[PDB]
C-alpha cells in the first residue's frame, strides 16, 4: 500500500505482547536515560539512538524499560529537534536531488522523483501545521 509507488510490501517490526521490561534486563533506568542524553549530544537522531541502545545495551524498547519514549526523555533534558525527524529527512532528500539536478538537467527521472518527494513534504508539512508542531507560517524552501 505504498503511496507514490505500486509496492505492496508489509515488512515491519512486531512489537511483543508483553509491555514489561525483560526479566534478563538488569540495568538501572537512570543509566539508560543518561545514555540517551550522551548519544543525542553527539548529534544522533531519536531513531538512531534506539538502534544503538537495542543493538548494544539490551534496551528492547525505551518506553518499556524507562516508562517514557526517547522523544519525551530528550525533551525533558533540553534536547529537542528543530523540526520533526521524518520531515527533516524528507527535506534533506529533496536537497540532494535538487543539487543533483543542477549538474544533470537531462535526468528526467530525477526531475520526476523530486515532484513525488516535494508532494510528500507538503502533505507532511500540512499535518504538522494543524497539530501546531510547526509554526503556521512555515513553508518549504
Amino acid at each position: 500500500g505504498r503511496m507514490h509507488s505500486a509496492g505492496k510490501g508489509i515488512s515491519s517490526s512486531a512489537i511483543p505482547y508483553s509491555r514489561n521490561a525483560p526479566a534478563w534486563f538488569k540495568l538501572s533506568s537512570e543509566s539508560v536515560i543518561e545514555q540517551i542524553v550522551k548519544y543525542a549530544r553527539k548529534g544522533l537522531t531519536p531513531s538512531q539512538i534506539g538502534v544503538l541502545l537495542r543493538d548494544a545495551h539490551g534496551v528492547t524498547q525505551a518506553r518499556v524499560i524507562t516508562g517514557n519514549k526517547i522523544m519525551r526523555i530528550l525533551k525533558s533534558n533540553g534536547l529537542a529537534p528543530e523540526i520533526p525527524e521524518d520531515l527533516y529527512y524528507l527535506i534533506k532528500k529533496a536537497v540532494s536531488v535538487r543539487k543533483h539536478l543542477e549538474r544533470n538537467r537531462k535526468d528526467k527521472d530525477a526531475k520526476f522523483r523530486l515532484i513525488l518527494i516535494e508532494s510528500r513534504i507538503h502533505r507532511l508539512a500540512r499535518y504538522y501545521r494543524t497539530v501546531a508542531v510547526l509554526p503556521p507560517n512555515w513553508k518549504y524552501e
Binding site: 543525542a40 553527539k42 548529534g43 537522531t45 528543530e82 525527524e85
Partner: peptide
Amino acid sequence: IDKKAKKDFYRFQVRERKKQEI
C-alpha cells in the same frame, strides 16, 4: 556514530550555528 551524527538537527545545534553566523 560519527558518520551517523547530524550537525543540524537539535535546537541547540541551530542556535550554536546561529551564534557563529553573527
